Write a protein that binds this ligand. Structure first.
Ligand SMILES: CC(C)[C@@H]1NC[C@@H](O)[C@H](O)[C@@H]1O
Ligand SMILES: CC(C)[C@@H]1NC[C@@H](O)[C@H](O)[C@@H]1O
Ligand SMILES: CC(C)[C@@H]1NC[C@@H](O)[C@H](O)[C@@H]1O
Ligand SMILES: CC(C)[C@@H]1NC[C@@H](O)[C@H](O)[C@@H]1O
Lengths: 441, 441, 441, 441
């Protein structure tokens, strides 16, 4: 039994399933997916923040962008939907006509994912379940359906874990002015006791209805409601000890940390569980303006995943579905591509632990990542060397055997000074896909 | 960009327009203006506080007075409207049948005023704009009109600044017991988190709808809502840096202080901007029981204004209109009288600064006030001496010239010991109105 | 770098060396060791708390007991040292004339311990290092020696980790009234800002002088100083990431929990690292009145360690040295005995992890505990069965090889229903010592 | 009287003398001035902060640098003074044998300064007055003299205002670990209630002994002592209303803001009084390694002052004296040079106000700054144009007379489009020094 106080909640550590999962699917889906439009400006951390909100590459920020007159979104909206078309009207157009939760679940499973987390309420405040605290929801409007619950049921029947994303820190139904600068986030927030109660009642509602495996909050938690989390976390863990909580609440407790390119991404081994998140594209919500050139290739997804995992993290990859419930082909192809790689190399990923070091590189610059399972060390090349002779810089092994992972073939290697040389027959090199993988015992 | 914290908000100083304005018009108008009745007991600070609330001279406190059985208001009400007539019923009688916002604006402008501030919500909680947070408002009841917005538009078209008064500290729709003693104010207040949210949402609403030049709160701010003001003030100033806030919030920040006879009235020069407020009569809301004997004369208004200004303050003069929207003749005549004096002497008032001292008096007791504009010093007599020889006590001038302000005529004067003697030709003395004014360079 | 806030400090998890150490030695030593006397009443949780402080079995509480007149301690003190001998005078008799820190360290190492933690300051406030914050210390009085520093050097020379115990919660140099009842602890505390500063400064000094591997506070941290720990913990971890802190500070952070018979002792597997502590006898400080009847036998010590380890904990076993610095024979014998068992079976203890369950028992009630190392599961019997046929209740092994641990001999086994039968030749059983140990892969 | 609460303290605004002073002299002087050594790396905001503390260009940070072994400072110290020479020993070498406070004051006055502020205590905690709170001060050690008091008398004899700098935020007499990275500042602080008392007591003592015209704190105020400032500020203002405080306390109140190149430097007109500070060179304390290459030229100093003044600020220019109390020639030359320009053009600087805009430039890019005195607008060119025809971009004058400032000669000008043309006879241009100055009425 957990008690409602930070010192007692510290007894809850990240559950084993999460630590072993390594790969999950994020889903940003809502009424913003209907217009599904943003200018693909660039990546966060690379686009200047004095312009970011004025040319926001996140399609799910459509409403905020629309509130900024003459932003590209405003022009687009006016020309496409007209001035007499309020954002909320998109809830009636969000019909999810072609949604099939079992197909989604089957796809996520085939992609190699072990948990799924959809946006139950994003910044626009629209709720994707039949909440009793607002009528701005999927059961009363557009879909006429409990999207969260129906997806939960499908994800679980496919054997995957199910978490929930909730925008606790922002809700545009409680503010009128848009965020134009990063600094506006320090004061343009709901700010009321009423909003703190609402956020508390809704996350408790999600806990009671769906008992999620992960509570993924975003944008911090209302300051007036922070003390409520001691009770909410105890209430939650006492009903589901294997549940978990991310680190975006702004209180002392969390089970795992979160990182993005610009924030908290480690260069080497941290001593705590974390999770890296990013979209297949530059937006989280569907953006019809994105082409393959704005997306990671299957190879980059694999490398991203390997890097993350070798550093002790899980990858939470975001998918942005359309308003009709379909997953765009460009995204689906990248998911299947990753799932194929995982079906071959999954044993060197799932259930692994970090090694003594995460990283190395060859003499000719190919990057290498390591993962471990007891006595077995997985050596994962981000790429496949062309020549059979391979020199890994600054590494020596006290193992007695190095095998080619996929074929299981013993290989010849020797510590040559401060480096490690391994001979990989070209036949073997040709059997690998995207990554040459070795196994040392 | 202002940040939501007291130290950063300190960077916002009183805007120049307010400092230069000197004279504004307060308007206490609401459903209490229909019965428009109070016993004209006396001035605040002069009437004993153990009786004040039982024989309240403020007609806008009608509801509170009515809740005190057998107070004069209760007797009056029962005899006039009857016991089966609840105070709220006055909202349906408040029809503002003869209201013309442009006439009001024209009158205020002719009176010499530079800003106007109406009660958007007084203690009775009735709102004079179409707020979405209560149906007890002017758009839904009586007037069927947005009084605040329509007046805002007129005041601005006449070139005047527009502020809003809001009763943040008291709202009788949230309490049942009347205030009978000053000490009752320490505990008979809304007190709930709900009320703090409401006050916050309504002032933010006024900011978003009308973007006022002044936020004039009264009776303090709900304790549970004080931290909200850091955000509200930043939000406000970032949309209108030339806006301003009075000092009745009970938090660290304010742009100017407020004073009344009994409170904070300076005797000499303070080092900060302030504003003196009082009604033309003894009430703020219309009181049909007041006669000329309960009101300041045009002369007393002028003297009051001069004294205030010479001490660095602005005068915020209150007008109490009738339920039909007309301004009673006694008040209108006093406003025009003041406006006439200002049209002649305005250059020695508007845009001035305090001098080294505010005050002096003649050998025969006539009071004198000073104001300044760079090298010009205005010497304003509260009255017009009868003899041509004038001896100002304890004053010497290092100027090289003293002129009669209205005619511009050079005058003969000399420092005679510790006094100053000036000869003012009787012809000149006869050209002045209410105040003999001199100009020294 | 760690930051001074609980959220950031949560990133520091229990260091891997502590997790793997399993066994440490506690040392309560101080001026109270000179009289070294207490009435050996019983185990905590077994003695009525209405009498506990009056017949305190803890010799280190001598001073508090001495302050309760007519306690057995007061009678003994008066008769032995005299009514005029003030407790503090024991600091002049605490000479540690026969102390050899290298001998202690070698004994602790032979005992099988991996870390050692002496009392740097217990409740009587006497400090065993040359602290600059009080003259009541071992450098200025008694030993004329830095005992903590010399012990630290020796323990480290021996290859063991070194931590410090500090009585943050109690310091009788700041109070005059004794603790008579449990409830007295809620208010007979130093209570001042001065003491909060003093505790902070002394632990900071311990960190700067000795950079201990464990900060083991006792009796809570002064309330006025709790916020300081955010800074102390960050400072400490930033200088020594592999350092650790216990859970007796009363703030949100800790790396491991502590338990005693009556407190926090788990029945099965908790999800966090914890540590069980108890003495060899009934007191922590040396008690000349204890004989073998009041101490655990070597067998009981082994069973204790095994049970704690099978449940994820470390055993922190206390030694109470005499005033001359020697360790009594009865304690030294039990230490060497435990050390011989660990030399034989250490591989089933050190560096292990918990299995799916901690416990089981045979058909004739012999208790069994499990520990794990990757694929190897160690089955430790709390005792040595007499017959070769062994039936383990409610246990089935999906292993494929069960071996006698000491000889490595393969054994015959079979999952018979909900049980597991195993035959162990008596010659193998006769080779074991105190515990039969099997190994399953 | 001012009251001890932020709301009441807000009544105190920046004193008129500070607003008009425009230029003051900062003095970093202390025991660190004896070694007077640092590696002149670069300007703050220009040097990478990951190396900053390791190659600190600030000689006054000698002690912190000395605590980082293998810093250039440590190498220099060992070779010059010896490994056994503890930093504190510099207090015995700080003799100020050639110090003449009257000479310093006269130089500061000739330099054109109106106020002077010496370091009473910098981060090393050494106090330059006979404080009763520590023996580490100039009366008991080194100079055997009250330097702050003798300097105060001299500065005032010279007719200048006198303030005090105090390192409230840092005191290395309360810490042992050096600051290596910016982040270290969040926790390597005194942190105790004792230090909070100490800082309060010392500033109170400075107020009581010297009643300074400015309290210039640095590095924030200890968190546990922030509430004390309400009382300290009231106490101070009630004894000296014309006193002032800077903005580095971390509490709601301040009279003026402070800025440095990298911090708070305005691009145009802010609405509050502020002050720019920087040294003549790259260090604040004397650095024997700096030559003319690391210092501002007289021209650059003038351009600096003018720019800061046209934007509403005061320039607080730092001088770093040697350990013997003399001011190095290179700094004295630049001071006298600036003083000669102010003797010629001071009327366009002292007692001025900002105009409608601070800035403009000529067609060939000469920068121009404006200042104002009632009707007189001063047009200060940052340089002296070579040809007589001058075209000012985007400027139109509704004046009627433009005169050469130095000679008073009336000049020919014309608003030509969005620009202003002016002809300035070369004989007038040749009469100017460093800056061409015009005057428009
Ligand atoms: C990382 C991801 C969850 C993003 N968090 C910040 C949000 O503003 C954005 O829409 C998206 O949800
Ligand atoms: C000064 C004026 C604004 C008065 N403030 C106190 C109120 O109770 C009263 O009705 C009136 O508004
Ligand atoms: C467990 C052990 C460290 C005990 N803690 C409580 C103290 O009062 C007692 O003397 C002993 O140190
Ligand atoms: C601006 C000046 C007063 C500097 N403030 C920061 C200090 O660390 C530095 O030594 C110097 O005093």
């Amino acid at each position: 039994r957990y008690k409602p106080d930070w010192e007692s909640l510290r007894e809850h550590t990240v559950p084993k399933w999460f630590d072993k999962a390594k790969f999950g699917i994020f889903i940003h889906w809502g009424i913003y997916s209907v217009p599904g439009w943003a200018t693909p400006t660039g990546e966060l951390g690379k686009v200047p923040m004095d312009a970011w909100f004025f040319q926001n590459p996140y399609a799910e920020w459509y409403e905020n962008s629309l509130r900024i007159k003459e932003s590209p979104t405003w022009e687009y909206h006016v020309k496409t939907y007209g001035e007499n078309f309020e954002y909320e009207k998109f809830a009636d157009l969000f019909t999810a006509e072609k949604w099939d939760p079992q197909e989604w679940a089957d796809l996520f499973k085939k992609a190699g994912a072990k948990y799924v987390i959809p946006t139950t309420k994003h910044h626009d405040g629209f709720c994707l379940w039949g909440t009793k605290y607002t009528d701005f929801n999927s059961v009363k409007r557009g879909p006429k359906r409990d999207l969260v619950g129906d997806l939960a049921k499908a994800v679980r029947e496919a054997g995957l874990r199910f978490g929930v994303y909730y925008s606790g820190g922002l809700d545009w139904r409680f503010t009128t002015e848009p965020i134009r600068y990063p600094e506006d986030l320090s004061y343009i927030r709901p700010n009321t006791y009423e909003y703190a109660d609402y956020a508390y009642k809704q996350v408790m509602e999600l806990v009671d209805l769906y008992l999620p495996d992960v509570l993924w909050n975003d944008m911090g938690w209302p300051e007036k409601g922070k003390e409520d989390l001691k009770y909410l976390f105890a209430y939650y863990y006492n009903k589901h000890p294997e549940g978990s909580v991310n680190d975006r609440w702004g209180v002392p407790h969390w089970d795992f940390k979160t990182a993005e390119y610009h924030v908290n991404y480690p260069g080497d081994l941290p001593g705590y569980k974390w999770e890296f998140t990013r979209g297949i594209g530059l937006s989280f919500g569907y953006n019809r303006n994105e082409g393959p050139e704005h997306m990671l290739s299957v190879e980059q997804l694999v490398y991203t995943l390997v890097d993350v995992v070798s550093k002790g993290g899980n990858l939470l990859l975001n998918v942005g579905p359309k308003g009709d419930g379909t997953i765009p082909d460009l995204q689906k192809e990248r998911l299947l591509g990753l799932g194929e790689w995982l079906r071959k190399y999954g044993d060197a990923i799932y259930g692994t632990s970090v090694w003594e070091r995460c990283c190395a590189k060859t003499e000719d610059g190919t990057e290498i990542r390591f993962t471990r399972k007891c006595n077995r060390i997985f050596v994962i090349f981000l790429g496949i060397p062309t020549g059979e002779k391979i020199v890994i810089e600054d590494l020596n092994l006290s193992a007695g055997t190095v095998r080619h992972f996929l074929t299981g073939e013993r290989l010849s290697f020797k510590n040559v000074g401060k480096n490690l040389e391994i001979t990989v027959p070209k036949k073997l090199l040709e059997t690998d896909s995207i990554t040459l993988v070795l196994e040392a015992v």
